[PDB]
């Protein structure tokens with residue numbers, strides 16, 4: 001068979017350098033393993049390498065060792081072509097459904113294997129796509145069911161780096177699709193950022209943005225230190241779960257979760273990621289990492305720019321960002337008060353379902369609640385994905401769309 | 414000697430019925446004990462007894478037994494005359510410094526005793542006075558020092574019902590003034606509301622507002638069920654501390670604290686509150702109460718009105734929540750601008766160890782509030798919650814010019 005991959009960075013902006021650095025590093029790792037460029041589809045906004053703030057024009061790095069990972073990465077879906085619609089069309093292997101981009105798709109055969117890696121922002125039941133796009137978990141599961149039904153592959157492995165990423169699969173991912181999934185976090189935890197300015201081992205001092213994400217660099221650094229003909233998918237999962245837990249300190253670490261067909265964990269990793277002949281296998285028998293969560297990276301980036309000195313212009317941008325977050329947080333809190341009463345709003349909106357249950361029972365209701373909210377309160381933006389469990393809980397409570405319209409009108413109009 | 418009292422409700426509005434009900438109940442208790450009306454000064458906005466929402470016009474009750482406590486209460490300082498300036502002038506006993514009101518003051522003699530009871534809203538280092546007035550703790554301590562210096566009394570007992578009320582005395586109340594103080598809560602705890610609609614023992618069903626406050630009804634119900642010629646100030650403190658703790662469940666109770674001269678705890682309570690002749694032979698000196706948080710009572714009152722009705726009430730709830738969010742967000746943003754994103758909240762929210770003053774420079778505290786309100790608008794009663802953030806900005810060494818810049822960016 002043939003090995004294929006789909007690598008997706010769901011964000012943009014220099015502050016989010018790390019998501020595109022993670023995806024570029026994954027591309028280089030797969031090419032070194034012998035996967036062919038024609039079988040790897042890359043989604044990256046592509047605004048980082050030549051960004052005016054990049055201290056190394058034309059270069060992207062993903063760890064303090066400073067090796068460029070940008071040269072040679074294909075421009076399959078970049079800019080406004082990085083959309084959920086193109087991602088689904090690419091996975092399905094239907095070139096007629098793609099809009100723009102290179103036209104490269106996963107037109108795979110039954111004997112082939114596929115590896116999907118996403119890095120970005122997210123929230124309960126959702127992943128980000130650039131410029132305020134939201135990708136819903138059930139729509140992604142639906143694409144996997146369609147791909148499986150058309151006999152497009154033998155096995156698939158999916159790695160997802162995003163906040164509350166366990167919520168994209170919990171209670172909804174079937175185990176009969178020949179798909180194995182791991183996520184950076186459980187359904188109620190944040191994802192963590194690594195290689196930030198001021199941390200040790202020291203990233204190059206010219207960088208003002210973080211270089212990578214914890215779970216992402218954990219799997220990539222693990223692959224590029226083992227002979228992948230001998231390391232199994234299970235061995236990588238355990239090593240990534242250990243590193244991402246950050247010495248089991250869940251105040252600065254997360255629980256890596258697994259979903260889908262666990263029989264795939266017995267497979268050798270080279271069947272999905274290739275084999276790099278240069279790698280000297282490092283036997284199994286590292287230091288605690290200084291990390292920040294995805295949601296905190298933005299203000300830290302702006303504050304670093306303010307401290308490195310236009311000085312009052314950065315302070316105004318920080319104020320606008322904080323005010324925007326406060327507007328979204330306050331509007332959601334207020335909707336809970338109007339729907340359930342003071343003292344009952346927060347418990348309803350913030351309650352987390354028992355393990356194993358889906359985030360929401362009706363995913364079309366979830367999309368409608370977001371639509372009604374944004375029509376009165378404005379776009380959720382990437383930050384607003386944090387509030388997706390509040391919208392799911394309004395759906396699950398039995399509150400009607402007409403009642404949500406009334407509460408949003410009072411809260412925001 | 415002569416026994417004097419000053420009773421103050423620091424709030425207004427039908428939602429705050431309880432603070433005036435507590436003060437009216439205290440007045441009746443003191444009159445039953447033989448204190449004279451001429452020696453009791455009452456501060457109450459006086460908007461409750463005849464309020465359009467009051468189901469018993471001209472009546473105020475302070476517990477589910479429904480006994481009126483309003484009839485006969487004097488109108489010394491009401492409406493716009495309930496001010497910190499008049500409270501200070503009354504305590505000092507200087508009628509020429511009073512503006513409006515009856516002119517009654519505590520013109521006490523060296524042999525006299527004084528009892529002060531305040532019930533209201535508050536915050537770290539501050540108490541409320543009606544219509545967005547803030548009374549600072551050090552200004553109240555200063556009045557006590559002045560009154561002591563002029564030999565105006567033998568001993569004084571002060572009971573304070575307000576959120577974070579321990580912060581009004583911690584690190585600043587001297588023990589050499591012949592003044593003993595108890596507070597409903599410690600310096601970092603809220604105070605609790607009793608007799609709310611829907612709770613048991615059931616208040617009369619026609620009430621949509623809470624009837625009293627936990628620490629306040631604890632001391633008053635204790636006083637009126639005992640012979641005060643035998644009960645000491647210490648016995649009342651221990652009984653009030655036990656009841657206010659609500660079976661030591663500090664998720665629905667608070668820590669009653671004591672400050673000042675603890676030698677006064679050995680005194681019989683009748684020397685301050687009088688003796689009710691009907692209590693002579695009562696036995697010598699309970700169920701868990703359902704209580705509501707003092708800052709939570711407002712939205713619960715509006716929601717009860719909404720349930721018993723209306724889109725106009727929902728709009729009022731939205732305006733209230735949006736206003737609180739504006740104040741909370743502006744304060745949080747100022748902390749980010751002054752200290753940076755991962756440091757603002759720890760600086761603004763850090764609580765000093767017990768026994769330390771809230772702020773080292775009280776004039777700086779007033780200046781920070783002044784600068785904030787000039788850009789962000791009035792703190793209002795709710796905004797008193799943020800007084801520890803302003804104190805922490807002062808204590809951190811941040812300059813007034815830096816506070817001006819941060820407030821201008823956050824609110825202008």
Ligand SMILES: *[C@@H]1O[C@H](CO)[C@@H](O)[C@H](O)[C@H]1NC(C)=O
Pocket residue numbers: 175176261263
């Ligand atoms: C996994 O392997 C076991 C043992 O062969 C088998 O019983 C099970 O059905 C397989 N998993 C799935 C998804 O069916």
Ligand SMILES: *[C@@H]1O[C@H](CO)[C@@H](O)[C@H](O)[C@H]1NC(C)=O
Pocket residue numbers: 588589674676
């Ligand atoms: C309290 O009484 C004790 C004697 O029991 C005395 O030593 C102390 O100075 C008194 N306190 C004050 C503040 O006078």
